[PDB]
């Protein structure tokens, strides 16, 4: 096993192999903090994320096993991927800290939206990569459900990777499909397509499409643009209070996207209209959206791969903290790094 060295960063203790040098904090999330480092084996800067209290409870323990098993499965250019996984522990009884290594990106999509003037070619390329990674993710039977700007890491090259959890260093509600906020409790993959549609609209206009103050106000803003739900959608709503409140609204017609997004590429307006429909069954899928004329300059059917089937059976099991702890330890030991290009 490699040699480790210890240091304190942000009132935290980091124990990492010697190969990673010059640790520098980037940001923090709710389940871990991220540092930039120099990988002496490759000469590249990487990103090292120390999980916060990985095995403090059953919930934390399962979440840790979930992220590790998921990340180990993600092998795609537009999806965050694992370059290395390490723990300072040399035994399972010592096992209590988990680190994850990945490529170091340039910034979040909030920082690229901060400039507020993206060229239409920037939107084609950025949204094409999101959709490309989303097709891979959705091919694994995986739904993201929390897509938002902080989840899109980009380099100055404009190359994009989808992150499972971004840096909290944006309410999230602004990018959630309406069914989620209705608590439908069983979502199509197209819930992510709705999020993508909300992101693309921001990149084009420079403003939040649905900057709602809460969940009801959010649904009210959505209704203004897309219009009141049709009779065939109201049938599918079981909650009477939900139906009653949606029906009891004053009712508004669907706005013409050509007007609200005037000045934008007409091919982008058509794509948005196919993404932001209330019926999840009618929303364009990631695969179909890649074939949209808006992406003619980047689309390649032979270079948009799918993922192997991902087994999420463990999600229904209720196990003890030590069982989740040992399975995670098993996944750390079984890790095989990808070959350096
Ligand atoms: C390594 O952590 C993980 C490990 C495994 C799974 C997920 C993660 N999370 C995670 C990974 C990445 C890679 N990049 N970024 C990033 C966003 S913004 C920025 C920046 O400002 N980069 C400048 C400053 O030095 C260049 C860099 C990340 C932010 C993250 F939350
Ligand atoms: C790189 C692939 C990203 C996988 C997305 C899962 C991590 C973000 O999603 C998380 O897990 C749940 C799974 O549906 C989501 O529903 C929750 O919103 C969130 O906690
Ligand atoms: C508040 C504004 C009306 C919200 C309408 C959202 C309709 C979402 O669409 C629905 O998604 C469900 C799963 O999430 C599917 O079971 C339904 O078939 C589909 O129509």
UniProtKB/Swiss-Prot annotation:
**Positions bearing Phosphothreonine:** 12
What GO cellular-component annotations does this UniProt entry give? cytoplasm; cytosol; glutamatergic synapse; mitochondrion; nuclear speck; nucleoplasm; nucleus; spindle pole
Q: List S-S links within the chain.
A: none
Query: Which reaction equation describes what this protein catalyses?
Result: L-seryl-[protein] + ATP = O-phospho-L-seryl-[protein] + ADP + H(+); L-threonyl-[protein] + ATP = O-phospho-L-threonyl-[protein] + ADP + H(+)
Start and end residues of each Protein kinase domain: 20-295
Report keywords, A-Z.
Acetylation, Apoptosis, ATP-binding, Cytoplasm, Kinase, Nucleotide-binding, Nucleus, Phosphoprotein, Serine/threonine-protein kinase, Stress response, Transcription, Transcription regulation, Transferase, Ubl conjugation
| Gene Ontology MF, one | kinase activity
**What Enzyme Commission number(s) appear in the record?**
2.7.11.24
Tell me which InterPro entries the record gives.
Kinase-like_dom_sf, MAP_kinase, MAP_kinase_CS, MAPK14, MAPK_p38-like, Prot_kinase_dom, Protein_kinase_ATP_BS
Q: Where in the cell is it found?
A: Cytoplasm; Nucleus
Q: What class of enzyme is it?
A: transferase
Binding-site list for ATP: 26-34, 49
Protein modification: Dual phosphorylation can also be mediated by TAB1-mediated autophosphorylation. TCR engagement in T-cells also leads to Tyr-310 phosphorylation by ZAP70. Dephosphorylated and inactivated by DUPS1, DUSP10 and DUSP16. PPM1D also mediates dephosphorylation and inactivation of MAPK14. Acetylated at Lys-49 and Lys-148 by KAT2B and EP300. Acetylation at Lys-49 increases the affinity for ATP and enhances kinase activity. Lys-49 and Lys-148 are deacetylated by HDAC3.
Q: Which cofactor does it need?
A: Mg(2+)
**Tissue-specificity statement:** Macrophages, monocytes, T- and B-lymphocytes. Isoform 2 is specifically expressed in kidney and liver.
Give the sites modified to N6-acetyllysine: 49, 148
**SMART domains, sorted:** S_TKc
The subunit field of the Swiss-Prot or TrEMBL record says: Component of a signaling complex containing at least AKAP13, PKN1, MAPK14, ZAK and MAP2K3. Within this complex, AKAP13 interacts directly with PKN1, which in turn recruits MAPK14, MAP2K3 and ZAK. Binds to a kinase interaction motif within the protein tyrosine phosphatase, PTPRR. This interaction retains MAPK14 in the cytoplasm and prevents nuclear accumulation. Interacts with SPAG9 and GADD45A. Interacts with CDC25B, CDC25C, DUSP1, DUSP10, DUSP16, NP60, SUPT20H and TAB1. Interacts with casein kinase II subunits CSNK2A1 and CSNK2B. Interacts with PPM1D.
Q: What is known of its domains?
A: The TXY motif contains the threonine and tyrosine residues whose phosphorylation activates the MAP kinases.
Give the function comment from the record: Serine/threonine kinase which acts as an essential component of the MAP kinase signal transduction pathway. MAPK14 is one of the four p38 MAPKs which play an important role in the cascades of cellular responses evoked by extracellular stimuli such as pro-inflammatory cytokines or physical stress leading to direct activation of transcription factors. Accordingly, p38 MAPKs phosphorylate a broad range of proteins and it has been estimated that they may have approximately 200 to 300 substrates each.
| Protein's recorded name | Mitogen-activated protein kinase 14
**Organism phylogeny:** Eukaryota, Metazoa, Chordata, Craniata, Vertebrata
């Amino acid at each position: 096993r490699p040699t480790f060295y210890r240091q304190e960063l942000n009132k935290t203790i980091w124990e990492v192999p010697e190969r990673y040098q010059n640790l520098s904090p980037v940001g923090s999330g709710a389940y871990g903090s991220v540092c930039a480092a120099f990988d002496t084996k490759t000469g590249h800067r990487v990103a090292v994320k120390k999980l916060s209290r990985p095995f403090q409870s059953i919930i934390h323990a399962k979440r840790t096993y979930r992220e590790l098993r998921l990340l180990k499965h993600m092998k795609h250019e537009n999806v965050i991927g694992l370059l290395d996984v390490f723990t300072p522990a040399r035994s399972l009884e010592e096992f209590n800290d988990v680190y994850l290594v990945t490529h170091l990106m340039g910034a979040d999509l909030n920082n690229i939206v901060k400039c507020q003037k993206l060229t239409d070619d920037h939107v084609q390329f950025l949204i094409y990569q999101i959709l490309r990674g989303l097709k891979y993710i959705h091919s694994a039977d995986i739904i993201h459900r929390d897509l938002k700007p902080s989840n899109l890491a980009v380099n100055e090259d404009c190359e994009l990777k989808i992150l499972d959890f971004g840096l909290a260093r944006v309410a999230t509600r602004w990018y959630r499909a309406p069914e989620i906020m209705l608590n439908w409790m069983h979502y199509n993959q197209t819930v992510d397509i709705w999020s993508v549609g909300c992101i693309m609209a921001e990149l084009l206009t420079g403003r939040t499409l649905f900057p709602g103050t809460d969940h009801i106000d959010q649904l009210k803003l959505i209704l203004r643009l897309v219009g009141t739900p049709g009779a065939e959608l109201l049938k599918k709503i079981s909650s009477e209070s939900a139906r009653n409140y949606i029906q009891s609204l004053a009712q508004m017609p669907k706005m013409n996207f050509a007007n609200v997004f005037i000045g934008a590429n007409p091919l982008a307006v058509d794509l948005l209209e196919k993404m932001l429909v209330l019926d999840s069954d009618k929303r364009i899928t990631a695969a179909q959206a890649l074939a949209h004329a808006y992406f003619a300059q980047y689309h390649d059917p032979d270079d948009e791969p799918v993922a192997d089937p991902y087994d999420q059976s463990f999600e229904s099991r209720d196990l003890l903290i030590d069982e989740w702890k040992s399975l995670t330890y098993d996944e750390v030991i079984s890790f095989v790094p990808p070959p350096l290009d």
